[PDB]
Amino acid sequence: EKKAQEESKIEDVDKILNDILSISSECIQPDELRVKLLLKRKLICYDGFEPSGRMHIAQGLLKSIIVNKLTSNGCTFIFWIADWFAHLNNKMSGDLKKIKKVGSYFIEVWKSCGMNMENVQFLWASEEINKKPNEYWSLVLDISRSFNINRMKRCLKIMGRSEGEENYCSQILYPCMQCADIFFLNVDICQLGIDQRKVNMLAREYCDIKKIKKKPVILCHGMLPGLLEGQDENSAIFMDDSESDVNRKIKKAYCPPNVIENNPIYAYAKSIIFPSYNEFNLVRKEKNGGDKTYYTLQELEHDYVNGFIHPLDLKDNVAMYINKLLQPVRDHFQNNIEAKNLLNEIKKYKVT
Amino acid sequence: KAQEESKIEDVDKILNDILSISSECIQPDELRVKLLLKRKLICYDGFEPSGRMHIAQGLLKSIIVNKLTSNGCTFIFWIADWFAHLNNKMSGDLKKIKKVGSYFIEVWKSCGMNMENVQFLWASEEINKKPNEYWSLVLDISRSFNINRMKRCLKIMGRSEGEENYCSQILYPCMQCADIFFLNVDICQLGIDQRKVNMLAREYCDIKKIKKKPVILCHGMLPGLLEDENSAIFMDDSESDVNRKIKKAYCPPNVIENNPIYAYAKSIIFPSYNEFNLVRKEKNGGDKTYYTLQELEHDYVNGFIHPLDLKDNVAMYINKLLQPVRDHFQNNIEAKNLLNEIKKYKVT
Ligand SMILES: Nc1ncnc2c1c(OC(F)F)nn2[C@@H]1O[C@H](COS(=O)(=O)NC(=O)[C@@H](N)Cc2ccc(O)cc2)[C@@H](O)[C@H]1O
Ligand SMILES: Nc1ncnc2c1c(OC(F)F)nn2[C@@H]1O[C@H](COS(=O)(=O)NC(=O)[C@@H](N)Cc2ccc(O)cc2)[C@@H](O)[C@H]1O
Ligand SMILES: [Cl-]
Ligand SMILES: [Mg+2]
Ligand SMILES: [Mg+2]
């Protein structure tokens, strides 16, 4: 009993570790993630969002699957409404009133994205920062003392900017603040897209500079590609798209036969549809011979390169399953009259 | 009647007194407009608690502040504690920075600034009272200027572009620029080494279409004593320290430019006594009382005043002006322990 209780505990951490890594395109030190799973408390994870218009399905549907996997494995998750960051980054022409409306719309979508809200929080940056402004801004100032300008300009990607354009001082303040959020929120796991990893590597550098041994674990998820080959409004599906809009965008999306690399249609099947249902039921023509079910990811790869999966069949299955997962969101913005007028209000905004 | 004619008399008199502080006031005509809107203008200067107080920040500041406050203005001493930490002063130790700040207040209250129209404000304390307004302003300023434009303000921190440029060197001038608006400052009265960030604040007004623009009233920099601790006189120097540093100081004959000894006589001693009594042996020219700066300058450039004679009187005058400060830190026990504490601090 005394020995058997140790063996089950070790295998318990091993399986929790392995399926947390399954949703990560890359993890900065899986050995550190195992150490954090051995602590008798829940791990704090977070992702941050600039309210700058309609919601990408990666931020609604893809996020719901990741947060569900983390909260079922001893983690709590924070949605960070980066309102002040969107203002600093000139989103919505910097209009703070519009940013807050888009933030409220994001929370309305997330609340009906099929997530489990028992261990999930929605926190607003400006609210939390002004609750403890001495601690927060002292962190920001101490981070600015630690890195030079060129080191910080390597984080431009986290705000969708580049060195080719005019670099405003806000592009130095922004990554200092995002880096400070990681410690301000006492985050254990930084669960953001790979486009944010530069500033998360910075936070780990800051721990070694300041001799902080509680370094955050970076658990970056891959970026869902654009629908067109080599990746405006038709580049991805959004949470408010209708059943007709999804079918139209998927129909003209890039889906090369017998090839899965850079295939956004297949990428939707692997990252969105499959983890939602834990299977993929490929329905086909009325008599040609379809309605087949898959169960793991490895057999999905082997059969698309095999030719048993036609492009029109994969696209129509992807488009159909995307519409099923989006229907709880459409139903909420149809029956709940207050959210319906909220959606109509933010759709009249001009995307900057 | 003739009561309107005496109104321009009062305004033009205050104009002349205030404009005498700076050699290049940014638009004197705007200053006259501010005085007609209200007499109680708000002036400020800001200080990093980074060690012992330079006499420019004590004896020279007192000359400037009392000129402004006697004309109905308010003067804010901005004890820039967070800026000193951001600039790596006192090894960034905030507890020692606060200690130096308290010592700065004790010097100022004993060298002519214990008065109702002077306020001692701490940066961290005031920012934390209205943090949403302050930091929103810092962020909006950062959105309005690019990196190269902000790196021009490096001089306000005592840095240069040839050294390693940290991100704190971008945040610092954003926060100093915000202070001008946060404090509702009418007149920025700082040394000319701070002028570039004040010009930035006026650019920010034109970008934001803000009509209330600050007037920049920058005073000249006292040159350094050398051509460390000996490159300047400090408010806590003893008589022997002042005499030693003056004697070994730079004082080129016939040349007043970059002359710290002549600068102390012209900017500190002459305004304090409305004269300069040059004590000399008869064979060296004999005692002479200077009533104007024009004759003082003419005599020095023509060789009538040898540098040794100027040094001896300047050192004697500096020691007489530091006497209220010394008596305060010698007699007041709590001020004595404060100075003794900050003396053993290492500078960085
Ligand atoms: N196609 C895709 N596939 C997979 N993941 C994707 C996307 C995508 O597409 C996009 F164009 F909409 N975004 N994301 C991910 O969603 C989240 C928000 O996105 S964001 O608004 O851009 N956030 C920022 O810019 C961050 N500086 C905001 C921020 C601020 C302070 C913090 O303390 C933490 C974060 C981040 O995690 C992103 O990685
Ligand atoms: N030799 C001299 N002759 C004539 N004036 C002199 C000096 C001298 O010598 C020196 F080395 F000690 N300082 N000053 C003047 O004293 C004051 C404070 O000086 S400081 O501590 O350096 N503060 C800074 O630099 C400022 N960025 C701090 C600051 C921060 C936020 C604000 O909202 C405003 C200001 C400023 O007005 C300076 O011009
Ligand atoms: Cl506030
Ligand atoms: Mg007072
Ligand atoms: Mg004599």
Numbering used by the authors:
A (entry chain B): 15 to 245, 252 to 372
B (entry chain A): 17 to 243, 252 to 372
The article reads:
Whole genome sequencing of one parental and three resistant clones revealed nine newly acquired mutations in the resistant clones, three of which were in PF3D7_0807900 (position 403,556), corresponding to a Ser234Cys mutation in cytoplasmic PfYRS. YRSs from wildtype (PfYRS), mutant (PfYRSS234C) and human (mature HsYRS) were produced in Escherichia coli. These conformational changes may promote dissociation of the charged tRNA, thereby preventing the hijacking reaction.
Like E1 enzymes, aminoacyl tRNA synthetases (aaRSs) are adenylate-forming enzymes (AFEs).
